[PDB]
Amino acid sequence: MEYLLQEYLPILVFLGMASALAIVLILAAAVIAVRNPDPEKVSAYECGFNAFDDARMKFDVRFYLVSILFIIFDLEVAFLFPWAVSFASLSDVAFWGMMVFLAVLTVGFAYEWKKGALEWA
């Protein structure tokens, strides 16, 4: 397909080019700068005193519920992009069907808000 070749192959080419530029910048210091590691240098930073522990412990995420609702809301908005692109050609059902779809969304959003699910645990 021509559209693939003219428009999408440049994306693939530039993905490699931007990757090469980022990699060369990392390797620049890896090759030029002096490397002199010692146990104190490579230890974890906690403001001058040794860390109590590493960062591989459980940690309560007080916004966990909002993150679950983030997944749901992501899919709701996805249905709007083809609708917005097709807006000129929409039929009466196609137009008001979205309004019903968005009204059901707003009932869910009003339920979250009223329940208190948007306040952190």
Partner 1 sequence: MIGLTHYLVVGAILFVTGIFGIFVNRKNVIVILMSIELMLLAVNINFVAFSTHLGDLAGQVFTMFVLTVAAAEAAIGLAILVVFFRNRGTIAVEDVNVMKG
Partner 2 sequence: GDIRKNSYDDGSMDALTGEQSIRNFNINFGPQHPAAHGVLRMVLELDGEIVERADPHIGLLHRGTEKLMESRTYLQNLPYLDRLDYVAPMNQEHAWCLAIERLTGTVIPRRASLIRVLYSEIGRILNHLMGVTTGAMDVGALTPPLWGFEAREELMIFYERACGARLHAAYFRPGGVHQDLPPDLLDDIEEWCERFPKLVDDLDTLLTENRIFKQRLVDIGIVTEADALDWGYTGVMVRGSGLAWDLRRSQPYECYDEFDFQIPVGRNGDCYD
Partner 3 sequence: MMTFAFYLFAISACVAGFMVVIGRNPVHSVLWLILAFLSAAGLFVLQGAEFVAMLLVVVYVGAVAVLFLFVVMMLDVDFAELRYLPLALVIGVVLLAQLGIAFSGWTPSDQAESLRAAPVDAAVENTLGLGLVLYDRYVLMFQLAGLVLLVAMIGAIVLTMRHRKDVKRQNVLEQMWRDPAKTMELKDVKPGQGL
Ligand X SMILES: CCCCCCCCCCCCCCCCCC(=O)OC[C@H](COP(=O)([O-])OCC(O)COP(=O)([O-])OC[C@@H](COC(=O)CCCCCCCCCCCCCCCCC)OC(=O)CCCCCCCCCCCCCCCCC)OC(=O)CCCCCCCCCCCCCCCCC
Ligand Y SMILES: CCCCCCCCCCCCCCCCCC(=O)OC[C@H](COP(=O)(O)O)OC(=O)CCCCCCCCCCCCCCCCC
- Calculate ∠ Cα 66-72-77, nearest 5°: 115
Q: What is the rounded distance in angstroms from the CA atom of residue 108 to the CA atom of residue 102? A: 10
Q: Which is nearer to partner 2, 35 or 56 (CB)?
A: 56
Applying CB under 6 A, the residues found at the interface with ligand Y are 4-5, 8-9, 11-13, 19, 23, 26-27, 30, 35
Residue 67 binds to partner 2 (criterion: CB under 8 A): no
Type of residue at 118: L
Cβ atoms of residues 51 and 44 within 8 Å: yes
Q: How far is the CB of 71 from partner 1 (least distance, A)?
A: 5
Contacting residues toward ligand X, per CB under 6 A: 106, 109-110, 113-114
